[PDB]
Amino acid sequence: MRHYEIVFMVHPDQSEQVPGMIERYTAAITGAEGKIHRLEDWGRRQLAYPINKLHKAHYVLMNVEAPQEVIDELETTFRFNDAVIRSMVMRTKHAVTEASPMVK
Amino acid sequence: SLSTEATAKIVSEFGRDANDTGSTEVQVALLTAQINHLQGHFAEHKKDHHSRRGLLRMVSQRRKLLDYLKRKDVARYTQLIERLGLRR
Amino acid sequence: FCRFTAEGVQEIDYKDIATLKNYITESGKIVPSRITGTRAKYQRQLARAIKRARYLSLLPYTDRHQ
Amino acid sequence: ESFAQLFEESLKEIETRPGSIVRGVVVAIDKDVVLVDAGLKSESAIPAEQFKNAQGELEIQVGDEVDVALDAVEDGFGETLLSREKAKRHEAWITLEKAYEDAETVTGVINGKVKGGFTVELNGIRAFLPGSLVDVRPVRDTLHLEGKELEFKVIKLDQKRNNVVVSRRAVIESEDPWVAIAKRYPEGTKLTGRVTNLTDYGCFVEIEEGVEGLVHVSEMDWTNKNIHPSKVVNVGDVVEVMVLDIDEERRRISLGLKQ
Amino acid sequence: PVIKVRENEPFDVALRRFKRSCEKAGVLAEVRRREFYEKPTTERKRAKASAVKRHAKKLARENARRTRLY
Amino acid sequence: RKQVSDGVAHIHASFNNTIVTITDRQGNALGWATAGGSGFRGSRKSTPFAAQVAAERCADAVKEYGIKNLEVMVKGPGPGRESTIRALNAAGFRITNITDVTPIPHNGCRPPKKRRV
RNA sequence: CUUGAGUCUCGUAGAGGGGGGUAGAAUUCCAGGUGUAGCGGUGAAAUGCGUAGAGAUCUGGAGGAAUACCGGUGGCGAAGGCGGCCCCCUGGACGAAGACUGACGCUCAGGUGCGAAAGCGUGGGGAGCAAACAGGAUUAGAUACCCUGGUAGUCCACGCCGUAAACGAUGUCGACUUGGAGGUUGUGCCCUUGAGGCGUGGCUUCCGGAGCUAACGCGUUAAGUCGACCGCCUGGGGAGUAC
């Protein structure tokens, strides 16, 4: 429908919970016949500046071709979920399946 | 704007050839649909003045087209206005 | 002497942090298109990318802040 | 007729833009201005200093032929960029010749490293090379008789920015500038750079593959303020300069010359 | 303009470096600019005026240069 | 008083008056001095010399703490900026870092109106 | 009938508009730590804040407003105007080829809408700034300029107001007439042999030719050469006032 690109940052103490969260997110996307073109756990990462007093955080990239309702839902979930510190759902023109420059 | 598929559909229905697209009637239909679509938007967003300008322009264009149709060929115009449900 | 014209990139990536780092100051500021000689079209894109990065804590807003 | 059209495409065919075709005949000499005519719209105001060879006196009388250079047209009145750069292409060709047989042989004599590589001079010109290139091993030409005769065996060349470090003695043995701007960095790496334009606050020596250096007015000499850089150095000349400072961000490498 | 004195570096040199850094930053200038409120109009005017001046310097002067002084 | 080897010098350099404050690395102020305090008033205290002497005074004040290493944080625009740090150096601390810490907003609050003189 | 006008296809750049989120810097205040006599301010002072612990400095919190750098005689918009980042809704512009419609066009008195800032109404909000006001200076006086404070207001919602040097002091639309140097945004070909080479469109900054102009100047974005429609002027004041 519309090709979004999502990057969310999880609190580093909840790093072991991340995979489950990712799975959940994927599931929702799948539900509305939404494809998920790339998905990249960047892992624990040093922040350029300390958001909410903490210096590292766990970054997950995820590209999705989904309807906007589901995106909205995801956003809502993120906002209420306290594990995820920041998110940045961000539209894109194409599917962009090729890997990110920091993974490579 | 009007989605491509929708536009195509509109063209097919009103246009005689379906490849035509520029038929007066077809154009009018296209305009009308757009106007209808924008009504919903403008109910929500009453202060969106700039956008409303475009809508107004479109309406004017439609009116002009209708007028043109009327002088040329009355029956067709009548048919069109029955189809679309334009009071005038 | 623009890099992005020669590379022929379609869009500048906020994730490509290293690249960004060449166009950012020691103090964190985005470097002018006079100095870098970046093309105008690309420059804006680059700036946007940098901003995005800053939001994601990939790049810093400034050297001092903590 | 089409005689002229054909003559035009003929004359297009029998010239090219760079200093390649040795065509300008020296048609007036006066100190300090040489002048040629390579089939261009006007005659060059040549310096005398693009034409004296290795000890200071002139070498070419009337009728003699060197190509110059091009791609720059009309600053008001006149035609060229200097033929001496011409010469650089010839030097490049000889350096390239190495590739064929994997060994360019001339003479290279390198006494010392301004910036970590002995300086080698070939014919009139002198070039700077990275520190390893001067010696094959750890021999070091400091114990060799000063300004000794070998050749140059190439160690390293930078391929964009022109720095070539060459192999003295041991005959038996046989975007782009700004990401990795850490090569000439570390505090004081001396460079050989041609100055370009002196902007009454500066001199703008800039050689190392698409960068910009200043050497502004404060150093330049051992007088501060009364100096006026046009009096004190040159126009278009390869000099002693080193970095003293790099910002890889606001591309201002701030070189010096008082060293 | 964060700086660290290198091992066996003179004080004066360090100071100079710091100064240079500051200059590069344009921190002082920035401060000066934000001392008082500039009306938008005024800001616009300065920018355009400055631009005009620059243009004048570039072209008219160049034209003058073509002709010799004595 | 507990002696401390390393600390910070905060140099608040205004247009009218320089204030030097030596503190520990954590934030807790050890001593301070000012150009206004050093026996300079109006025209005099808005000068580099004044700033320097303030700095000197400050240094003197934190003698008992036994401070060898010192990082400097320079704030605001003023004469007392280079001079002050020089003075500090003279007074005989190993100057470790020289930081600028001027508060630059990213266009935030409206400044006061421009003076008509 | 297709050259004007419009429709369709694919892209393009954009501070165009409306709505909802969020980020970081800085100011202010609150609470607490450290610390000690000044701070602040000016031409110079004083009022003012300070030993009831200010200023400085560090930690934590609150809240509002605006978005450094990018940033440009850059961009978009009918004009007014529009500037962090993200999403949702949405208007226009331009190019590339085709395909279609077939004069459907231009202008417009009345009419209708949009229309900076200040201002008004009701309800919120209120950090900073600041008409009014107060004090301190300056001064012959100082109902000002400068300083210290400071309330409407600025901010948001929904209404009204309908004006500005609302300016390019230049109505809109179309056609035609030598050139140069740029900027920006497409697009066709070319060995992109390289940041290039040769074109071709849109918008745009400066200089200047003919011509025009009282001169200043304008000059393919005309103030030139013409056509279509509208608006407006008829000495200064009285007056854009009175009724």
* Cβ-based neighbours of D219, under 8 Å, separated by 6 or more: D256, D257, D258, D259
From D164, D224, D229, D244, select the one nearest D196 (Cα to Cα): D229
Provide, as residue numbers in chain A, all residues whose Cβ is less than 8 Å from the Cβ of C65: 49
Helix (H/G/I), strand (E/B), else coil: B62: helix
Gap between the Cα atoms of A38 and A26, Å rounded: 11
Region for residue E4 given its phi and psi (left: phi exceeds 0; alpha: psi -120 to 50; beta: otherwise): beta
Q: In the 31-50 stretch of chain C, whose C-beta falls under 7 Å of nucleic acid strand G?
A: 31-34, 39-41, 43-48
State the amino acid at position E30 in one-letter form. E
Residue C32: its H or E element: none
Complete DSSP assignment for E19-44? HHHHHHHTHHHHHHHTTSPPPHHHHH
State the amino acid at position D106 in one-letter form. V
From F105, F19, F14, F1, select the one nearest F55 (Cα to Cα): F19
**Residue D180, exposed/middle/buried by CB under 10 A (0-12, 13-18, 19+)?**
exposed
Q: Are D34 and D26 in contact (CB under 8 A)?
A: yes
Q: Are D242 and D213 in contact (CB under 8 A)?
A: no
Q: Phi then psi for C19, rounded to 5 degrees? A: -60, -45
Cβ contact, residue pair C25, D250, below 8 Å? yes
Resolution (A): 4.1
Alpha helices in C1-66 (DSSP H): 3-7, 17-23, 33-36, 40-55
Residue F3: its H or E element: none
Residue whose pair of structure tokens reads 């993120």 in the numeric block: A78
Residue A101: its H or E element: none
Assigned token pair, D74 = 């009309």
Experimental method: cryo-EM
Cβ contact, residue pair A101, C18, below 8 Å? yes
From D126, D124, D108, select the one nearest D192 (Cα to Cα): D126
Assigned token pair, E43 = 């800001």
B48 touches strand G (CB under 7 A): yes
Gap between the Cα atoms of D204 and D197, Å rounded: 6
What are the Cα distances from residue D68, in Å, to D31, D87, D89, D92, D123? Answer: 19, 9, 11, 16, 19
Q: How many domains does chain C have?
A: 1
Chains A and B touch (3+ CB pairs under 8 A): no
State the amino acid at position F64 in one-letter form. E
Residue whose pair of structure tokens reads 């006196």 in the numeric block: D57
Residues in chain D, total? 259
Region for residue B9 given its phi and psi (left: phi exceeds 0; alpha: psi -120 to 50; beta: otherwise): alpha
Gap between the Cα atoms of C64 and F46, Å rounded: 27
From D188, D182, D220, select the one nearest D201 (Cα to Cα): D220
Gap between the Cα atoms of D81 and D46, Å rounded: 9
**Residue C29, exposed/middle/buried by CB under 10 A (0-12, 13-18, 19+)?**
middle
Gap between the Cα atoms of C52 and C44, Å rounded: 12
* Cβ-based neighbours of B45, under 8 Å, separated by 6 or more: B51
State the amino acid at position A96 in one-letter form. V
Gap between the Cα atoms of F58 and F75, Å rounded: 16
Provide, as residue numbers in chain C, all residues whose Cβ is less than 8 Å from the Cβ of E21: 26
Partner residue opposite E31 with nearest CB, options F86, F98, F102 = F102
Domain that holds residue C51: 1-65
Distance measured from the CA of protein residue D185 to the C1' of nucleotide G74, in angstroms: 35
* Cβ-based neighbours of A6, under 8 Å, separated by 6 or more: A61, A62, A63, A64, A74, A87, A88, A89, A90
Give the sign of the dihedral formed by CA D89, CA D93, CA D95, CA D99: positive
- Give bridge partners of residue D157 from the DSSP assignment: D164
From A50, A48, A47, A54, select the one nearest A14 (Cα to Cα): A54
Contacts by residues E38-41 (CB-CB < 8 Å, ≥ 24 positions apart): E38/F114
Gap between the Cα atoms of F61 and F76, Å rounded: 23
Give the sign of the dihedral formed by CA C44, CA C48, CA C50, CA C54: positive
**Residue D251, exposed/middle/buried by CB under 10 A (0-12, 13-18, 19+)?**
buried
Gap between the Cα atoms of E56 and B44, Å rounded: 52
Alpha helices in A13-59 (DSSP H): 18-31
Helix (H/G/I), strand (E/B), else coil: F70: strand
Task: Find the nucleotide nearest B57 (Cα to C1′).
Answer: G91
Residue whose pair of structure tokens reads 């995801």 in the numeric block: A74
Distance measured from the CA of protein residue A70 to the C1' of nucleotide G235, in angstroms: 76
Gap between the Cα atoms of D133 and D116, Å rounded: 9
- Classify strands A90-92 and A2-10 as parallel, antiparallel or unpaired: antiparallel
Gap between the Cα atoms of D121 and D107, Å rounded: 9
Gap between the Cα atoms of A102 and F16, Å rounded: 50
Gap between the Cα atoms of A42 and A7, Å rounded: 10
What are the Cα distances from residue A7, in Å, to C14, C19, C54, F92? Answer: 11, 19, 13, 51
Provide, as residue numbers in chain D, all residues whose Cβ is less than 8 Å from the Cβ of E20: 245, 254
State the amino acid at position A16 in one-letter form. E
Complete DSSP assignment for chain F? ----SEEEEEEEE-SS-EEEEEEETTS-EEEEEETTTTT--TTTTTSHHHHHHHHHHHHHHTTTTT--EEEEEEESSSSTTHHHHHHHHHHT-EEEEEEE-----SS-SPPPPPP--
Domain that holds residue F20: 1-117
Provide, as residue numbers in chain F, all residues whose Cβ is less than 8 Å from the Cβ of C64: 99, 101
Measured between CB atoms, does E10 come within 8 Å of chain F?
A: no
Please give the distance of CA B34 from its chain centroid, rounded to a whole number. 7
Question: Crossing angle of helices B49-72/B24-44, nearest 10°?
Answer: 150
- Classify strands D33-35 and A2-10 as parallel, antiparallel or unpaired: unpaired
DSSP assignment, residue A17? Answer: G
Gap between the Cα atoms of D121 and D166, Å rounded: 10
Gap between the Cα atoms of D165 and D168, Å rounded: 10
Gap between the Cα atoms of B2 and E61, Å rounded: 56
Region for residue D202 given its phi and psi (left: phi exceeds 0; alpha: psi -120 to 50; beta: otherwise): beta
C29 touches strand G (CB under 7 A): yes
Assigned token pair, D37 = 């005519």
Q: Are C48 and C39 in contact (CB under 8 A)?
A: no
Residue whose pair of structure tokens reads 């500048």 in the numeric block: C12
Question: After which residues does chain E show a gap where C to N exceeds 2.5 Å?
Answer: none
- Classify strands D238-239 and D193-194 as parallel, antiparallel or unpaired: antiparallel
- Classify strands D65-66 and F94-100 as parallel, antiparallel or unpaired: unpaired
Q: Are E16 and E6 in contact (CB under 8 A)?
A: no
B21 touches strand G (CB under 7 A): yes
Q: Are C11 and C49 in contact (CB under 8 A)?
A: no
Q: Cα angle at F60 between F56 and F66, to 5 degrees?
A: 125
State the amino acid at position C35 in one-letter form. I
Q: Phi then psi for D14, rounded to 5 degrees? A: -115, 35
From D249, C30, F72, D257, select the one nearest E19 (Cα to Cα): F72
Domain that holds residue B50: 1-88
Residues in chain A, total? 104
Q: How many domains does chain F have?
A: 1
Gap between the Cα atoms of F113 and E37, Å rounded: 5
Assigned token pair, F33 = 């001095």
Residue whose pair of structure tokens reads 């360090």 in the numeric block: E14
Determine how many CB atoms are found less than 10 A away from the CB of residue E45.
12
Helix (H/G/I), strand (E/B), else coil: A41: strand
Distance measured from the CA of protein residue C41 to the C1' of nucleotide G75, in angstroms: 11
CA R_g for chain B: 14
Query: Cis before residue B67, ω within 30 degrees of 0?
Result: no
From D201, D200, D197, D208, select the one nearest D241 (Cα to Cα): D208
* HEC string for chain D: CHHHHHHHHHHHHCCCCCCCCCCEECCEEECCEEECCCCCCCCCCEECCCCCCCCCCCCCCCCCEECCCCCCCCCCCCCCCCHHHHHHHHHHHHHHHHHHHCCCCCCCCCCCECCCCEEEEECCEEEECCHHHHCCCCCCCCCCCCCCCCCCCEEEECCCCCCEEECCCCCCCCCCCCCCCCCCCCCCCECCEEECCCCCCCCCECCCCCCCECCCCCCCCCCCCCCCHHHHCCCCCEECCECCCCCCCCCCECCECCC
Region for residue D147 given its phi and psi (left: phi exceeds 0; alpha: psi -120 to 50; beta: otherwise): left
Determine how many CB atoms are found less than 10 A away from the CB of residue F114.
12
Give the sign of the dihedral formed by CA D210, CA D211, CA D216, CA D221: negative
Q: Cα angle at F83 between F80 and F87, to 5 degrees?
A: 120
Chain C residues within 8 Å of chain D (Cβ atoms): 1-4, 6-7, 18-19, 22-26, 31-32, 35-36
Stretch 19-78 of chain A: residues touching chain C, C-beta under 8 Å: 47-51, 57, 59, 61
From D189, D171, D165, select the one nearest D246 (Cα to Cα): D189
Question: First-to-last CA distance in chain C?
Answer: 35
Q: Cα angle at A88 between A86 and A89, to 5 degrees?
A: 140
* HEC string for C14-25: CCCHHHHHHHEC
Gap between the Cα atoms of B68 and B76, Å rounded: 11
Question: Crossing angle of helices B24-44/B4-14, nearest 10°?
Answer: 140
Q: Are E27 and C62 in contact (CB under 8 A)?
A: no
State the amino acid at position E47 in one-letter form. A
Strands in F69-75's sheet, in edge-to-edge order, are: F29-34, F18-24, F6-13, F69-75, F94-100
Q: Are F70 and F9 in contact (CB under 8 A)?
A: yes
Assigned token pair, D186 = 């570390």
Helix (H/G/I), strand (E/B), else coil: F91: helix
Q: Are A46 and A56 in contact (CB under 8 A)?
A: yes
